[PDB]
């Protein structure tokens, strides 16, 4: 049977949009807007945006829907360089170690809601320590009934002494965890069909809880005061050579590319779509989402600030576990606190559950292509893929946990999602064919992209990618959590990780060199050409030995 196709179109947009859509796109992009610059912070993100975040998109779009296949079975225009398939197959596979830990902990709060009295509000219980002092007028928001709570109640953090001392799961968030996975594995088993209807509710709840906490939030004291904090223009914050590497790393971290997502996810589109007005859409509504969701989370932010008679530099911080801590408490003092802490939780969740399946769904399409035996049960395949990512992400259950979560969260994504699409960008760019591609996407859609895009596809997006991994590579800095420093050996399996994800390319590249046979020039020929060449090849006749080819845009 031929590949099957989306059921609508609209199926594959919400499909996209939800991916794409993530608890760390509502705080990313305002908590840097607020950080440095403010209004002024808009200039480099849209340039950056412009340069070297549409290109990429579209390229990805692109090559997904003409190759119909996966992450590794589109590397057919190039086959020495398929290990970026794997390369990226892995990123995927390690991201959701800690991504449905996430979503448990989430569902474990959303349980322990339905109740009068939010466990929450005072402290005045088994799992608090007598250092308990909410202040209403140095951590002001260390030791907070909130914070103990988050800290003691629910993940038992102080029961272990650091990464070396785990110590057994807990069964609640193990309880938590499994249903999560059964969710996922019922809403991936039946290929794309049940898995296209299914986020027409998970990626169209989260705007509606937006709205009702952005009505609610605005009205509070304070609000307008952290708004203005989150929109003030002051341009000589661009003289700084930090803000446009905020820009730069925020734009290739929040597009969503370097997972292999897209290329899956467009790799079921009929081969008459329209890529162009698909890649312009996402990429709006996915930057007007940050927008919004800043809106929302900056008036909660100065109204939190106003309560505890504090500055908003203070409340406004980066860390795991402070969604679990500022928020709650801010619920907790509204009337109805029980439904707004509902709702807000079922937000979190489904902003969760989204992206988790899209993550797995690029893992199980990629795979399922690249082997053909496993194409007639694409069920028990589902069940093996969530049955080993349940296994792996028990560790982040113990009560030590949360490090565990931090140096993945670390060390998972980090410069190999760079690497990775450079490496995919550089060679689609010049191994291929700027001129291929275009002609490829002419002959898909019907209108030839213009010179701009070639330009940005061959010439800016390789510096710019190759900038980003620099400056990203320059300026690491170990993990940490509050006073904790990790054991260096944390710190080699971390580096160790990240680069058994990148280190797949040279390998795969000297297994299909040392595969094929005959002689250097025979071998660089049937590696380095595309296979719709090969009869070119045999007669002799390589585009790419010619110096033309790669000096053509
Ligand atoms: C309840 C209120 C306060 C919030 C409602 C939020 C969502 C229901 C909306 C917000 C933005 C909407 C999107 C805005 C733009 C478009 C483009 C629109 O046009 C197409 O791309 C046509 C595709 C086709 O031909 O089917 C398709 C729906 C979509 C994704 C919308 C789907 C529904 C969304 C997510
Ligand atoms: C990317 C995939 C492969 C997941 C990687 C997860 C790591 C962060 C895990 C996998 C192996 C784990 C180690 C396996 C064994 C132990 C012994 C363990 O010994 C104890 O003190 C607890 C013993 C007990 O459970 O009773 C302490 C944690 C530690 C170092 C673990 C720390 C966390 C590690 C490195
Ligand atoms: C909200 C999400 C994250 C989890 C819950 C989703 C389930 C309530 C849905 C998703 C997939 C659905 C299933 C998708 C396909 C089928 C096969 C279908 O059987 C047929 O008639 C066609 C196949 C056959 O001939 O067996 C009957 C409904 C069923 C079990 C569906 C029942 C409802 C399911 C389990
Ligand atoms: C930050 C918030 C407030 C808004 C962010 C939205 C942008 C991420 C989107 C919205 C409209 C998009 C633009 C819509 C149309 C085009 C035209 C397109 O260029 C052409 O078609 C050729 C024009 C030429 O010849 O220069 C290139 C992409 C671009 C700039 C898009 C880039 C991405 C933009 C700026
Ligand atoms: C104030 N502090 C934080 N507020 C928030 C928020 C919020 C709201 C959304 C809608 C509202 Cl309404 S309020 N998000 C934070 C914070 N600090 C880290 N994050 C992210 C980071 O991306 C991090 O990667 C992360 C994580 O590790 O979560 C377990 C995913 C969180
Ligand atoms: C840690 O990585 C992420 O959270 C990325 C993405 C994602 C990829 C894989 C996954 F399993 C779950 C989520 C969801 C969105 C798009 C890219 C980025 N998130 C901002
Ligand atoms: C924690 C993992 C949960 C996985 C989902 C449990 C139900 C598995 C059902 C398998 C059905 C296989 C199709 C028929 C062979
Ligand atoms: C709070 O008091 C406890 C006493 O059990 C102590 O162990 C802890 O270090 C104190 N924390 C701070 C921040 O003072
Ligand atoms: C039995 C205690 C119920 C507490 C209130 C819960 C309200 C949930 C409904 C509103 C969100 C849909
Ligand atoms: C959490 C509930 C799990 C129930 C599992 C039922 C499996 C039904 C499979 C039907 C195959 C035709
Ligand atoms: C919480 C998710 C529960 C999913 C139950 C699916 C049951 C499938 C029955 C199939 C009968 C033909
Ligand atoms: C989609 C439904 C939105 C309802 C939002 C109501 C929020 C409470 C308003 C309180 C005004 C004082
Ligand atoms: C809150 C997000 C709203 C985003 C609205 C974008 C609408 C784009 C429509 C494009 C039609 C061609
Ligand atoms: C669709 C439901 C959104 C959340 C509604 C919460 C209940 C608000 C009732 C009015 C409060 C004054
Ligand atoms: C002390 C009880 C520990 C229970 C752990 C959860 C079960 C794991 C099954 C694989
Ligand atoms: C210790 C009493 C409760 C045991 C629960 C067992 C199931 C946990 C999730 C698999
Ligand atoms: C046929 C169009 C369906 C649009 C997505 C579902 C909207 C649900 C609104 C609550
Ligand atoms: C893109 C140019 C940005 C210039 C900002 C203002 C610089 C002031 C220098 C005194
Ligand atoms: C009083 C300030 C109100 C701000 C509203 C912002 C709306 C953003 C688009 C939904
Ligand atoms: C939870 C384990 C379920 C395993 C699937 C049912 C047996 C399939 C045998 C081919
Ligand atoms: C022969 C039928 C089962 C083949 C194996 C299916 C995938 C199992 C996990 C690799
Ligand atoms: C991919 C090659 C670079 C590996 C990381 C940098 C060297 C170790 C720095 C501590
Ligand atoms: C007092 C003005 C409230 C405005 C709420 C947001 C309207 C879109
Ligand atoms: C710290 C930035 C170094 C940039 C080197 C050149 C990359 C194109
Ligand atoms: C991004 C546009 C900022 C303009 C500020 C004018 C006061
Ligand atoms: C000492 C307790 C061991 C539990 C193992 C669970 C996988
Ligand atoms: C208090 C949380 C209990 C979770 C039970 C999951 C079945
Ligand atoms: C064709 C039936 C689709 C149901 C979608 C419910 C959200
Ligand atoms: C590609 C990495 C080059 C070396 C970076 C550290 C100097
Ligand atoms: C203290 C040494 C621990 C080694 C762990 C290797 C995974
Ligand atoms: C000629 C092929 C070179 C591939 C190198 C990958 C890093
Ligand atoms: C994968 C690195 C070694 C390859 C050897 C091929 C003979
Ligand atoms: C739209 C950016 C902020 C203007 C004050
Ligand atoms: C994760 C890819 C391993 C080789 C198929
Ligand atoms: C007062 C205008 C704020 C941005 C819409
Ligand atoms: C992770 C192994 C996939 C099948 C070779
Ligand atoms: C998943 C591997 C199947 C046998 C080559
Ligand atoms: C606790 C999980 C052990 C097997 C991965
Ligand atoms: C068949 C190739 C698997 C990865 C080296
Ligand atoms: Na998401
Ligand atoms: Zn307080």
């Given at each position: 049977q031929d590949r099957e196709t989306?059921?609508?179109?609209?199926?594959?947009?919400?499909?996209?949009?939800?991916?794409?859509?993530?608890?760390?796109?509502?705080?990313?992009?305002?908590?840097?807007?607020?950080?440095?610059?403010?209004?002024?912070?808009?200039?480099?993100?849209?340039?950056?945006?412009?340069?070297?975040?549409?290109?990429?998109?579209?390229?990805?779009?692109?090559?997904?829907?003409?190759?119909?296949?996966?992450?590794?079975?589109?590397?057919?225009?190039?086959?020495?360089?398929?290990?970026?398939?794997?390369?990226?197959?892995?990123?995927?596979?390690?991201?959701?170690?800690?991504?449905?830990?996430?979503?448990?902990?989430?569902?474990?709060?959303?349980?322990?809601?339905?109740?009068?009295?939010?466990?929450?509000?005072?402290?005045?219980?088994?799992?608090?320590?007598?250092?308990?002092?909410?202040?209403?007028?140095?951590?002001?928001?260390?030791?907070?009934?909130?914070?103990?709570?988050?800290?003691?109640?629910?993940?038992?953090?102080?029961?272990?002494?650091?990464?070396?001392?785990?110590?057994?799961?807990?069964?609640?968030?193990?309880?938590?965890?499994?249903?999560?996975?059964?969710?996922?594995?019922?809403?991936?088993?039946?290929?794309?069909?049940?898995?296209?209807?299914?986020?027409?509710?998970?990626?169209?709840?989260?705007?509606?809880?937006?709205?009702?906490?952005?009505?609610?939030?605005?009205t509070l004291p304070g609000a307008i005061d952290g708004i203005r904090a989150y929109l003030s223009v002051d341009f000589y914050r661009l003289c700084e050579a930090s803000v446009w590497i905020d820009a730069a790393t925020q734009v290739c971290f929040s597009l969503g590319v370097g997972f292999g997502v897209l290329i899956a996810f467009s790799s079921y589109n009929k081969f008459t779509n329209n890529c162009?007005?698909?890649?312009?859409?996402?990429?709006?509504?996915?930057?007007?989402?940050?927008?919004?969701?800043?809106?929302?989370?900056?008036?909660?932010?100065?109204?939190?600030?106003?309560?505890?008679?504090?500055?908003?530099?203070?409340?406004?911080?980066?860390?795991?576990?402070?969604?679990?801590?500022?928020?709650?408490?801010?619920?907790?003092?509204?009337?109805?606190?029980?439904?707004?802490?509902?709702?807000?939780?079922?937000?979190?969740?489904?902003?969760?559950?989204?992206?988790?399946?899209?993550?797995?769904?690029?893992?199980?399409?990629?795979?399922?292509?690249?082997?053909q035996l496993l194409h007639r049960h694409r069920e028990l395949f589902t069940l093996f893929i969530v049955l080993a990512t349940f296994l792996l992400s028990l560790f982040c259950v113990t009560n030590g946990g949360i490090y565990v979560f931090t140096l993945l969260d670390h060390f998972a994504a980090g410069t190999s999602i760079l690497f990775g699409v450079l490496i995919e960008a550089i060679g689609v760019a010049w191994f291929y064919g700027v001129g291929q591609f275009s002609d490829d996407i002419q002959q898909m859609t019907g209108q030839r992209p213009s010179l701009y895009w070639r330009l940005c596809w061959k010439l800016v997006s390789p510096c710019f990618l190759l900038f980003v991994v620099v400056v990203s590579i320059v300026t690491f800095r170990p993990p940490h959590y509050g006073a904790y420093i990790f054991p260096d050996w944390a710190n080699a399996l971390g580096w160790v990780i990240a680069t058994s994800s990148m280190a797949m390319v040279p390998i795969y590249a000297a297994y299909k060199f040392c595969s094929l046979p005959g002689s250097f020039r025979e071998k660089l020929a049937y590696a380095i050409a595309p296979e719709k060449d090969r009869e070119l090849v045999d007669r002799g006749e390589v585009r790419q030995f010619t110096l033309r080819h790669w000096l053509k845009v």
């Open positions: 989306w059921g609508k179109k609209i199926d594959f947009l919400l499909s996209v949009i939800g991916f794409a859509v993530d608890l760390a796109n509502v705080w990313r992009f305002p908590y840097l807007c607020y950080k440095n610059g403010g209004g002024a912070f808009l200039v480099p993100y849209l340039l950056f945006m412009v340069i070297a975040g549409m290109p990429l998109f579209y390229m990805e779009l692109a090559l997904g829907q003409f190759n119909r296949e996966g992450a590794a079975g589109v590397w057919k225009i190039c086959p020495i360089l398929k290990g970026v398939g794997f390369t990226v197959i892995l990123i995927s596979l390690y991201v959701g170690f800690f991504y449905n830990v996430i979503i448990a902990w989430a569902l474990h709060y959303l349980f322990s809601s339905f109740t009068t009295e939010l466990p929450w509000i005072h402290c005045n219980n088994s799992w608090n320590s007598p250092n308990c002092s909410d202040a209403h007028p140095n951590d002001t928001f260390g030791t907070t009934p909130a914070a103990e709570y988050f800290e003691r109640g629910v993940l038992h953090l102080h029961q272990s002494h650091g990464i070396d001392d785990l110590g057994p799961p807990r069964w609640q968030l193990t309880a938590c965890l499994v249903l999560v996975y059964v969710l996922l594995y019922f809403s991936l088993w039946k290929g794309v069909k049940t898995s296209g209807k299914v986020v027409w509710i998970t990626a169209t709840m989260p705007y509606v809880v937006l709205t009702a906490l952005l009505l609610r939030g605005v162009y007005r698909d890649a312009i859409v996402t990429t709006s509504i996915n930057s007007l989402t940050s927008f919004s969701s800043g809106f929302v989370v900056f008036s909660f932010l100065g109204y939190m600030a106003q309560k505890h008679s504090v500055p908003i530099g203070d409340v406004a911080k980066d860390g795991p576990g402070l969604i679990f801590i500022i928020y709650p408490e801010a619920i907790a003092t509204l009337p109805l606190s029980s439904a707004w802490a509902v709702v807000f939780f079922i937000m979190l969740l489904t902003l969760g559950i989204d992206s988790a399946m899209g993550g797995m769904e690029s893992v199980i399409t990629g795979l399922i292509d690249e082997f």
